[PDB]
């Protein structure tokens, strides 16, 4: 800080964070450790003048890390399900992305790549690797040594690195039976070839594969995943679960309560809410974690540029299930006089809107919901 | 990739409609959508390979016996049905349905399926049965009737539960396959 | 030349003029289908004409017209594979260059449009 | 495709370079530029396939017979040249050009070719040769010299006319062929 009078200590705390990470994730730290860390630095900052607040909020960063890291480990070796692991490693990816230590963000990004790569979520492996690929650029210069992967390490003109990345992402979608994004990427890949590097052979092989993609799309037919909504209520949950609602991309042919079974597996306290539509206020506070499962409706996409065109079937069926971010759930409900001969005299449907953060498929086979709302439908309608 | 026809009939006081519609709808028990059309369908993977299937959901009144046999050919399996808590359904099936469906497609796997398993053990309901001399007839004699035909299988479900309902349809589809 | 003809048409569909439907083959033939055929056989020529730049140039339009209007993904694929053949060609085999000459006609017996004129001749490759 | 070593030598009073350049350039008679650099090359076919080639030009001085023999090797066709309108050049060629080439690489297809054929029957040029006692020596005895070595062809042309010059190089390349 005597040096920071001319410059900064920021380099210091950078590798501090870096190291600190590798050890704590490596499986050493303690929670009282962070408590004491915090304490001591607070005291010594009080011993120091003005910079005290600066250093202390930097330590707050440090703390935030530490508690999240220990939460990571406690879940990793408490629940022992790949999926909570995926949730928490996503949590750390987020946390760093906000904290902008992009390199370690990449590091866990590859970690989660390893995860999904184990579990054949070719789609999610591809997307995550693609969030990596995004940070890179189509320039030539290998600019900063962070972004370099952990498979080898030398210059890798970031142009070439991005090129590799696309090779593998395309590979994933190919075996991931989702060729539309595959072609989408193949566009940039060929264009960058022919406009910056003129490696025509790359062009040739690439668009050969692109032909394979178009053929396999319009030729075959694809199963569609059921979409289930889950809302974790009670009080015992990990905080990021209690009294939230999540939405799931199950198997293609998994009926509702098979998914319910698989989720109860995930959990102790296998108790289900039964009024599947509304939450329960007493459960908003009471312990003994609750949940409820019910399939929901994948709102149709809005295929751009297809607004009226004589679009074939495969195109529409593919947009039917994917790139989805709206969801409804139709509510049978009596409103009026309940004639015996008919059911229609009262049918009022309060379909529930489900606006989540992102669009399936994603980096995660599920997601939260960001916003919900209802409706009200006349039997006329 | 393939498809499978099947028919379902049963007593008209029970509306197996609710069974099939809640199943394919996959919605919550006792919260299903009642439609305006019959003859429901399902595309389900059972074991390894997915298969489509559509269920000829037919009206069961006897005067509708004159339209039903027109769809009898190539009925891959049939689903004969009743209500556990309805001895009247027992009479219906044993006396009309069982005999004439056995006549009509004598060589095709058949599974009888229960109903109102929840109602079969509703104490107020069964006490009404006794104060109306209806017998809350249980499984084992139902299985005995299954043996009476020696049906390739027999089960029960309950709409307000979906209990075994999945399994009901599981054996249903895998009987063909 | 045939490209000059194709230029008259549009990527619309309505067969607005039977005039372009010559005596050779002649039936319903929406405008779209004519333009598409013409492009197909023009690409044919250019490739077998051993000249590829314009070939890929025009294939670009043909492909995108498919994938935006007619979605004939099989034709998409075959077209693209042909484009790969084109690119491989351009990089692979070096092609002979043609000598260009100047021809300045003068005198009087030359035709009215030929007398006292100057022409340039894309002679053969090694003439 | 293939490239061929092509060597030409001749006396320092004729400027064979004019031949090589005004040929490869295809240029109009007298419309080329005398360049500064030697050891040319060209890429023009004869038939069937396009053949490349490399033109070895060395000046007419005597001492460079230490470097020219090291330029000789692996030349599939050397080409010997003279000027029909100088008998002194004739004795020069059969004194240095013909012999030492015959010596260093005695095995390579060869042609001797004349020069200034347009000037050879030029009345002023022939009369100036006479008043300087130089014979405008003609086809028969140049032919005799060719026969004496058997250089697989004997030719004679001009570069200011380019007449037969193209023929000179057609058979000069079919010399390989």
UniProtKB/Swiss-Prot annotation, chain A:
It is found in: Cytoplasm; Cell membrane; Cell projection, Podosome. It comes from the Eukaryota. Residues 96-381 form the DOCKER domain. Interacts with CRK and CRKL. Interacts (via N-terminus) with tensin TNS3 (via N-terminus); the interaction increases DOCK5 guanine nucleotide exchange activity towards Rac. Interacts with ELMO1. Guanine nucleotide exchange factor (GEF) for Rho and Rac. GEF proteins activate small GTPases by exchanging bound GDP for free GTP. Along with DOCK1, mediates CRK/CRKL regulation of epithelial and endothelial cell spreading and migration on type IV collagen. The DOCKER domain may mediate some GEF activity. Belongs to the DOCK family. This is Dedicator of cytokinesis protein 5. It comes from Homo sapiens (Human). The gene is DOCK5. The chain holds residues 1136 to 1516 of 1870 of the full protein.
From Swiss-Prot, chains B, D:
Changing residue 17 to N: Constitutively inactivated. Abolishes interaction with PARD6 proteins. No effect on NR3C2 transcriptional activity. No interaction with PPP5C. Doesn't activate PPP5C phosphatase activity and translocate PPP5C to the plasma membrane. It comes from Homo sapiens (Human). The effector region mediates interaction with DEF6. Changing residue 30 to V: No interaction with PPP5C. Translocates to the plasma membrane; also. Its main location: membrane. Changing residue 73 to L: In MRD48; decreased substrate adhesion-dependent cell spreading; weak dominant-negative effect. Changing residue 39 to S: In MRD48; decreased substrate adhesion-dependent cell spreading; dominant-negative effect; reduced neuronal proliferation. There is a cross-link at residues 147, 166 (Glycyl lysine isopeptide (Lys-Gly) (interchain with G-Cter in ubiquitin)). GO terms for molecular function: enzyme binding; G protein activity; GTP binding; GTP-dependent protein binding; GTPase activity; protein kinase binding; protein-containing complex binding; Rho GDP-dissociation inhibitor binding. The modification Phosphoserine is found at residue 71. Interacts with NISCH. Interacts with PIP5K1A. Interacts with the GTP-bound form of RAB7A. Interacts with SRGAP2. Interacts with CYFIP1/SRA-1. Interacts with PLXNB3. Interacts with ARHGDIA; the interaction is induced by SEMA5A, mediated through PLXNB3 and inactivates and stabilizes RAC1. Interacts (GTP-bound form preferentially) with PKN2 (via the REM repeats); the interaction stimulates autophosphorylation and phosphorylation of PKN2. Interacts with the GEF proteins PREX1, RASGRF2, FARP1, FARP2, DOCK1, DOCK2 and DOCK7, which promote the exchange between GDP and GTP, and therefore activate it. A motif (Effector region) lies at residues 32-40. Its EC number is 3.6.5.2. It comes from the Eukaryota. PROSITE patterns: RHO. This is Ras-related C3 botulinum toxin substrate 1. One of its GO terms (biological process) is actin filament polymerization. Transmembrane segments: none annotated. Changing residue 51 to M: In MRD48; decreased substrate adhesion-dependent cell spreading; weak dominant-negative effect. Plasma membrane-associated small GTPase which cycles between active GTP-bound and inactive GDP-bound states. In its active state, binds to a variety of effector proteins to regulate cellular responses such as secretory processes, phagocytosis of apoptotic cells, epithelial cell polarization, neurons adhesion, migration and differentiation, and growth-factor induced formation of membrane ruffles. Rac1 p21/rho GDI heterodimer is the active component of the cytosolic factor sigma 1, which is involved in stimulation of the NADPH oxidase activity in macrophages. It catalyses: GTP + H2O = GDP + phosphate + H(+). One of its GO terms (cellular component) is cytoplasmic vesicle. Changing residue 67 to A: Strongly reduced interaction with PLCB2. It holds the Pfam family Ras. It is a lipid-anchor.
């Amino acid at each position: 800080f005597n040096f920071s009078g001319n410059g900064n200590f920021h380099m210091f705390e950078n590798e501090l964070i870096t190291k600190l990470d590798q050890e704590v994730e490596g499986g050493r730290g303690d929670e009282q450790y962070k408590v004491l860390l915090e304490k001591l630095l607070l005291e010594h900052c009080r011993k120091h003048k003005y910079l005290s607040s600066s250093g202390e909020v930097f330590a707050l960063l440090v703390s935030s890390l530490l508690e999240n890291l220990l939460d990571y480990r406690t879940i990793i070796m408490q629940d022992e399900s790949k999926e909570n692991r995926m949730s928490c490693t996503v949590n750390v990816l987020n946390f760093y992305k906000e904290k902008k230590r992009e390199d370690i963000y990449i590091r866990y990004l590859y970690k989660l790549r390893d995860l999904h790569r184990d579990c054949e979520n070719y789609t999610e492996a591809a997307y995550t690797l693609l969030l990596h690929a995004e940070l890179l650029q189509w320039s030539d210069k290998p600019c900063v040594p962070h972004l370099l992967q952990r498979d080898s390490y030398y210059v890798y003109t970031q142009q070439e690195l991005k090129e590799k990345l696309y090779q593998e992402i395309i590979s994933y979608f190919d075996k991931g039976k989702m060729w539309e994004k595959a072609i989408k990427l193949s566009k940039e890949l060929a264009e960058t070839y022919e406009s910056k590097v003129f490696d025509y052979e790359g062009l040739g092989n690439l668009l050969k594969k692109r032909a394979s993609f178009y053929e396999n799309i319009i030729k075959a037919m694809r199963p569609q995943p059921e979409y289930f909504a889950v809302g974790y209520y009670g009080q015992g949950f990990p905080s990021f679960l209690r009294n939230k609602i999540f939405i799931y991309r199950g198997k293609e042919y998994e009926r509702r309560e098979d998914f319910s079974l698989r989720l109860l597996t995930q959990f102790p306290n296998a108790e289900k809410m039964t009024s599947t539509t509304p939450p329960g206020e007493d459960i908003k506070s009471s312990p003994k974690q609750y949940m409820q499962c019910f399939t929901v409706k994948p709102v149709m996409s809005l295929p751009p540029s297809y607004k009226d065109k004589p679009v074939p079937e495969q195109i529409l069926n593919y947009y039917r299930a994917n790139e989805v971010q709206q969801f409804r759930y139709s509510r049978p409900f009596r409103k009026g006089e309940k004639d015996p001969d008919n059911e229609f005299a009262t049918m009022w449907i309060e379909r529930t809107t489900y606006t989540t953060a992102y669009t399936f498929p994603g980096i995660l086979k599920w997601f939260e919901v960001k916003q919900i709302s209802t409706e009200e439908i006349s039997p006329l309608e | 990739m393939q498809a499978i026809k099947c028919v379902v009939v049963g007593d008209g006081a029970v509306a197996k409609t609710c069974l099939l519609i809640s199943y394919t709808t996959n919605a919550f028990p006792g919260e299903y959508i009642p439609t305006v059309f019959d003859n429901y369908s399902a595309n389900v993977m059972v074991d390894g390979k997915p298969v489509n299937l559509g269920l000829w959901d037919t009206a069961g009144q006897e005067d509708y016996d004159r339209l039903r046999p027109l769809s009898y050919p190539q009925t891959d399996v049939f689903l004969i049905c009743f209500s556990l808590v309805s001895p009247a359904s027992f009479e219906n099936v044993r006396a009309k349905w069982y005999p004439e469906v056995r006549h009509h497609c004598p060589n095709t796997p058949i599974i009888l399926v229960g109903t109102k398993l929840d109602l079969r053990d509703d104490k107020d309901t069964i006490e009404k049965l006794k104060e109306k001399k209806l017998t809350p007839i249980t499984y084992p004699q139902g299985l005995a009737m299954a043996k009476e035909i020696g049906a390739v299988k027999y089960l029960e479900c309950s709409a307000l539960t979906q209990r075994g309902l999945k399994t009901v349809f599981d054996e249903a589809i895998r009987a063909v396959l």
